[PDB]
Design a binder for these strands. Structure first.
Ligand SMILES: O=c1ccn([C@@H]2O[C@H](CO)[C@@H](OP(=O)(O)O)[C@H]2O)c(=O)[nH]1
Ligand SMILES: [Ca+2]
Length: 358
RNA sequence: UUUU
């Protein structure tokens, strides 16, 4: 039993997707410690209007002022589960809403959305049903682990530059000014917890958020949030076209799911400076490929993700937090399923299970 | 589950 991923099978009308609502938030601090508040949220602070153009040095501080998260620590859903536990009797939707929902990280859903168009990287998703609720947690594929261990030095510095860009664009207090002199600590994260629904599948998911724009006319989250991105500067119309067809699809998927309405991109030259900023409204991204024979279609993304959720819901019949259905996908094939019990795939921790039982 |  498998699930095909070809875009032609999902070419129908755009499916129902509920306007996402923010249910709460949590922060992870410099020590990767959880706090149920917004202490890690930063505030959009672009270059002053009368000053010179941006000239952000994205390599400044590498690697002396870089404190990277330890990628061997596999946190899975743990931080989101703690939020849920601390809010289980305050969830909107009425009684038993959680029992009919699917719970995951925003980034897991992003990978589903782009699957009909992805040709390089596959994925694996572990699924467990517990008290009706379906939990989806990404598993690092063996190939992606090897790629991570063999990360080239230049790719490591480019990873730093994406985080450094945010430091040039965000301040710790509204109206404040950025401080690039500090350290880039990728243990720090602000996460928004959202409710949505795709087709008939209710969703509870969390996603890291880069910053809140206090200058935005709308200030009810998530509409006051801004997503920050970098990309290489482009000259040729063929370069812009390739950007529209590949990078923009992943920017759209990531920001559409939580309802983040703007992506602000910093374009960097070969020497590692950002000398151009451009805002991309999420709801206009598809306009750049709407009439492109090699473009992407948001309806294909969303219809496939709805089909996968229905495929997952029907495949995971047993309610058991120790049982895992592992969904595996590689480009050129369908999504396949295998069944596993206990370690290493089981991911719901006993401190969650036992508290939810009682 | 952030980055490229
Ligand atoms: O991008 C692709 C390419 C192929 N397949 C699927 O891989 C199988 C053999 O080619 C087919 O699925 P079947 O066993 O149900 O017939 C094909 O649809 C996909 O799902 N996505
Ligand atoms: Ca970002």
């Amino acid at each position: 039993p498998s699930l095909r991923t070809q875009p032609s099978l999902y070419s129908g009308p755009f499916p129902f997707y509920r306007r996402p609502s923010e249910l709460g938030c949590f922060s992870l601090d410099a020590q990767r410690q959880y706090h149920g508040d917004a202490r890690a949220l930063r505030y959009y602070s672009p270059p002053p209007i009368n000053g010179p153009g941006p000239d952000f040095d994205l390599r400044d501080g590498y690697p002396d002022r870089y404190q990277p998260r330890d990628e061997e620590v596999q946190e899975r859903l743990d931080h989101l589960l703690r939020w849920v536990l601390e809010h289980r009797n305050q969830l909107e939707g009425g009684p038993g809403w959680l029992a009919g929902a699917t719970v995951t990280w925003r980034g897991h859903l992003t990978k589903l959305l782009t699957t009909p168009y992805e040709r390089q990287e596959g994925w694996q998703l572990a699924a467990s049903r517990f008290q009706g609720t379906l939990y989806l947690s990404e598993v690092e594929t063996p190939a992606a682990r090897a790629q991570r261990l063999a990360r080239p030095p230049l790719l490591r510095e480019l990873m730093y530059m994406g985080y450094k860009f945010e430091q040039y664009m965000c301040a710790d207090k509204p109206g404040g000014s950025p401080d690039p002199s500090g350290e880039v600590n990728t243990n720090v994260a602000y996460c928004s917890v959202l409710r949505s629904r795709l087709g008939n599948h209710p969703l509870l998911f969390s996603g890291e958020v880069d910053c809140l724009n206090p200058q935005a006319p709308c200030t009810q989250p998530p509409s006051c949030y801004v997503e920050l991105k970098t990309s290489k500067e482009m000259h040729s119309p063929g370069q812009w076209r390739s950007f529209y067809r590949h990078k923009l699809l992943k920017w759209w998927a990531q920001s559409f799911l939580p309802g983040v309405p703007h992506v602000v991109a910093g374009f960097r030259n070969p020497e590692g400076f950002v000398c151009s900023l451009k805002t991309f409204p999420t709801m206009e991204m598809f306009e750049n490929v709407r009439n492109d024979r090699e473009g992407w279609n948001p309806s294909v993304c969303m219809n496939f993700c709805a089909a996968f959720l229905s495929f997952a819901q029907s495949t995971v019949v047993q309610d058991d937090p120790r049982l895992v259905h592992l969904f595996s996908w590689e480009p050129g094939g369908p999504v396949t399923v295998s069944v596993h019990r206990d370690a290493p795939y089981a991911f719901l921790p006993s401190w969650y299970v036992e508290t939810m039982t009682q």
